[PDB]
Design a protein around this ligand. Structure first.
Ligand SMILES: CC(=O)Nc1ccc(C#N)cc1C(F)(F)F
Ligand SMILES: [Cl-]
Ligand SMILES: [Cl-]
Ligand code: NA
Ligand code: NA
Lengths: 306, 306
């Protein structure tokens, strides 16, 4: 029994983290095969950061301008180039600890594990969701840039996030591992803000199913609803629209618990309109939206990553 | 910025998890140097649940009755002994992945990371606290016994928990790595029940200091309290007594934020009286008690916001 916000085991990614120094800046890199990936803003001064021309800044750098430490051994950079907002540093040695991996770009609402790192040293691991407004509600201090986010699907690590910056409201923005930002952000010191966020409806439903599976049933009721009717309610409460694909994805949980998705939607409608009346669900007084349907199924079945 | 339930990177522990099989029972073991640690109830049969005599069960076993598998490799068991409620299986290979480590018994309120495992392979990592009633609120399915909890200081893994059983309320009980249970529990299926649980007051105060550090002051007030008056109030809400030890422990966070410990106690008193009135603290609508003072200092900046 029990339900906890759970990260993937981080060992396979820990073996890939390195320290990258350029000038006075140190941050983290991801060492896979013979390339180290890190944010291209590592090459900027604070003045550069105000309006950078990254190609122009890069051409003045030599391979030897990039100090890369894997643990306590230096890595020899032998080439350098950019792909979108990530710098690719070719090194003379393949990482012997490279896991089976892919670069994937995730959708808003999808979750992933973040391995927060400082000076190439992993320091903590936690679970995030890509918010509808394309930020993540992370926990990052100075020096964490280049920390990565990932899922594990078999023995394959799917890298999906590189940390780049913190927005004024304290949430975070980054890229996929091909250097494409999530969200309407740029790697420049200029006025930027998170857009208004919304709640991930299909994930809240997943968590309600998790709650039922764990014996928390007080919010269940006799009523059901329709998609159109429910989506009117969702829109009024700044919840994302629930689509038919969402319903299909929740199918397994509906069959296992005996609560059809629109049956559960009626529970959620009543919770939105009336609150929780002093009660909690899985120990929370808020409706939790950073568990995907897959997260709930995985944690409520015991899937492992040897 | 940000504040998350953050676990330690699990890779150092991942490299120690093995599968231990005895008869029809399979569970997890912890392989350090040439010893595999696991719950002694692995030797119990279906008749042995209520009043096992472990000395009598164990003396009937030979080294080759224990099957230990590390990844795809069988390890050879060359010795076995019982220490309290853990079995120590001596094997013919030192684990080449053994980290720097120690065994430490923790006190209620202390936090640690759990690497949930099944069949010797890690599933997920999350953060737990030893409750005042010596249980933990984990996420554990059948086959998770022998999963461990740990902290990592620098590069040294401190193992502090081994998972043994789930109590009827769905909370979890286990031992330190010397096999001594936390709390009054025993490895028998005789009826036993967790004591009423209480809130870890010093941790709530730590977390309120975290909120101030990340820039939230809305819950402070102009008042203070004596330590004894605080405790008289807080225990009416099922909060643990706050000791002078706890007040001393909070000194650093008090100095960093400029809010005296007993002034923060006054804020807590008001929060218990008033609730949050539709507001949140660090993203929660409930007061959080599974962050220790040490956790807050490790995760938060050293510079308080405003
Ligand atoms: C002071 C400053 O330049 N802040 C800043 C702003 C945006 C981005 C991006 N992307 C990165 C930074 C940096 F410097 F913290 F790396
Ligand atoms: Cl302790
Ligand atoms: Cl909450
Ligand atoms: Na219903
Ligand atoms: Na293993």
């Amino acid at each position: 029994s029990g339900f906890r916000k759970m990260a993937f085991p981080s060992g396979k990614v820990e073996g890939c983290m390195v320290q990258v120094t350029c000038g006075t800046t140190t941050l983290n890199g991801l060492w896979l095969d013979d390339v180290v990936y890190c944010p291209r803003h590592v090459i900027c001064t604070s003045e550069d950061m105000l309006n950078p021309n990254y190609e122009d800044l890069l051409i003045r750098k030599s391979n030897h301008n990039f100090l890369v430490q894997a643990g306590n051994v230096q890595l020899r950079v032998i080439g350098h180039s950019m792909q979108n907002c990530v710098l690719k540093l070719k090194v003379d040695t393949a990482n012997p600890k490279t896991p089976k991996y892919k670069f994937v770009r995730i959708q808003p609402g999808q979750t992933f594990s973040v391995l927060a790192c400082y000076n190439g040293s992993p320091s903590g691991v936690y679970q995030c969701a890509m918010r509808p407004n394309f930020t993540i509600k992370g926990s990052f201090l100075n020096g964490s840039c280049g920390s990565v986010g990932f899922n594990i699907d078999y023995d394959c690590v799917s890298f999906c996030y590189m940390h780049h910056m913190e927005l004024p409201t304290g949430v975070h923005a980054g890229t996929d591992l091909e250097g494409n930002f999530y969200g309407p952000f740029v790697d420049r010191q200029t006025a930027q803000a998170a857009g208004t966020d919304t709640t991930i409806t299909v994930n809240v439903l997943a968590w309600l199913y998790a709650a039922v599976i764990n014996g928390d049933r007080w919010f269940l009721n006799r009523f059901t609803t329709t998609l159109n009717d429910f989506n009117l309610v969702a829109m009024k409460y700044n919840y994302e629209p629930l689509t038919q694909d969402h319903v299909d994805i929740l199918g397994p949980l509906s069959a296992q618990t005996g609560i059809a998705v629109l049956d559960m939607c009626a529970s959620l409608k009543e919770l939105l309109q009336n609150g929780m009346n002093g009660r909690t669900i899985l120990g929370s007084a808020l409706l939790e939206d950073e568990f995907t349907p897959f997260d709930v199924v995985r944690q409520c079945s015991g899937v492992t990553f040897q």
